[PDB]
Write an enzyme that holds these catalytic residues in place. Structure first.
Site, mmCIF file in Angstrom:
data_model
loop_
_atom_site.group_PDB
_atom_site.id
_atom_site.type_symbol
_atom_site.label_atom_id
_atom_site.label_comp_id
_atom_site.label_asym_id
_atom_site.label_seq_id
_atom_site.Cartn_x
_atom_site.Cartn_y
_atom_site.Cartn_z
ATOM 1 N N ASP A 125 -9.153 -5.966 -9.865
ATOM 2 C CA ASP A 125 -9.813 -5.413 -8.678
ATOM 3 C C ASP A 125 -9.569 -6.340 -7.502
ATOM 4 O O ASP A 125 -10.271 -7.345 -7.344
ATOM 5 C CB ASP A 125 -11.288 -5.301 -8.959
ATOM 6 C CG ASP A 125 -12.031 -4.706 -7.782
ATOM 7 O OD1 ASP A 125 -11.391 -4.209 -6.864
ATOM 8 O OD2 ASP A 125 -13.284 -4.753 -7.821
ATOM 9 N N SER A 134 -3.141 -0.992 9.287
ATOM 10 C CA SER A 134 -2.049 -0.032 9.269
ATOM 11 C C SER A 134 -1.716 0.406 10.697
ATOM 12 O O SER A 134 -2.629 0.473 11.543
ATOM 13 C CB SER A 134 -2.437 1.177 8.397
ATOM 14 O OG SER A 134 -1.541 2.207 8.465
#
Ligand code: NA
Length: 330
Positions: A35, A199
């Protein structure tokens, strides 16, 4: 040193991926959920409340000649999905794919929430976010990666998740055979303890690319792609009959649909998520309503590039002094 381990989807939907991890001496192999959005290595154990264990493999520290209680240390964690676990702490030898760390904090669960009990395939979590998020008290502990780092050939790990197929976690090296083209690296903020990046935009299907900054985290422990409501609405508007269902808890679409791809930007590069990756199947067994793999981040307080996004790429988690993320097509 290096390590290389195969990671395997737990079910036909790629809800999560498990990676075998050796703990203790002699080795006890547990299948952990790696994770990148958390920083605790915790396991089902001989200490876990018996009614909360249903099929998991447990770690038994009393059977490990290298286990030592980390006296006084406790831990307690709550995840974004509402699940939780807590317990005490041992140090032990932990190996992943041939890479060994001695003295790793292994957080032994005394209690786990129902979602963990109900998932027989996950024996615990191995956190790979920054060690600033580790929940051990009163002495915070390091992740497996942070303890391995100085021994690694390069201070990196890579995630290469499969679509309905096994993939790989590598530690300490880039496998230049595992991706196509070049890797585009992008800046990381560690301020919230995550692999947080920005992004450069998105496109829906064959549509034009929208240049827009989207701050989010690279999180292998989250199944879906959670993005701002504007972006998510623009995606699902291209699917006839898709809608947001408050009763189901997100966007659903007709199982008869063919889904468009979704592209996200990494600098000037582009990662394309095929439409098929966004199908999470019937909302309930036999339903003709299917659950979407792109969902709104509104109310979660962060955008999350979970497995839907990451499995479309070869992802480099660069833990050099200035961390960065890399993405390549594959
Ligand atoms: Na679900």
């Amino acid at each position: 040193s290096t390590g290389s381990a195969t990671t395997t989807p737990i079910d036909s939907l790629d809800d999560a991926y498990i990676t075998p991890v050796q703990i203790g001496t002699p080795a006890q192999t547990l299948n952990l959920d790696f994770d990148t959005g958390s920083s605790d290595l915790w396991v089902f154990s001989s200490e876990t409340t018996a009614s909360e264990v249903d099929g998991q493999t447990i770690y038994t520290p009393s059977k490990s000649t290298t286990a030592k209680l980390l006296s006084g240390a406790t831990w307690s964690i709550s995840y974004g999905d509402g699940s939780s676990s807590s317990g005490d702490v041992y140090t032990d030898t932990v190996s992943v794919g041939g890479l060994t760390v001695t003295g790793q904090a292994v957080e032994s669960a005394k209690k786990v929430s129902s979602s963990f009990t109900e998932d027989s395939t996950i024996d615990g979590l191995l956190g790979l976010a920054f060690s600033t998020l580790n929940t051990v008290s009163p002495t915070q502990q390091k992740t497996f990666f942070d303890n391995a780092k100085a021994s690694l050939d390069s201070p990196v790990f890579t995630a290469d998740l499969g679509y309905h197929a096994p993939g790989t976690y590598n530690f300490g090296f880039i496998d230049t055979t595992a991706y196509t083209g070049s890797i585009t690296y992008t800046a990381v903020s560690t301020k919230q303890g995550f692999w947080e990046w920005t992004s450069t935009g998105y496109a829906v299907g064959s549509g034009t690319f929208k240049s827009t900054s989207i701050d989010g985290i690279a999180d292998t422990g989250t199944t879906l792609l959670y993005l701002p409501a504007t972006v998510v609405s623009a995606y699902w508007a291209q699917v006839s009959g898709a809608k947001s269902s408050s009763s189901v808890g997100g966007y659903v679409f007709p199982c008869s649909a063919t889904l468009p791809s979704f592209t996200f930007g990494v600098g000037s590069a582009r990662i394309v998520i095929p439409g098929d990756y966004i199908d999470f199947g019937p909302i309930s067994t036999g339903s003709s309503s299917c659950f979407g793999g792109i969902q709104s981040s509104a109310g979660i307080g962060i955008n999350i590039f979970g497995d839907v996004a990451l499995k479309a790429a070869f992802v480099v988690f660069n833990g050099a002094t200035t961390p960065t993320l890399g993405f390549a097509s594959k």
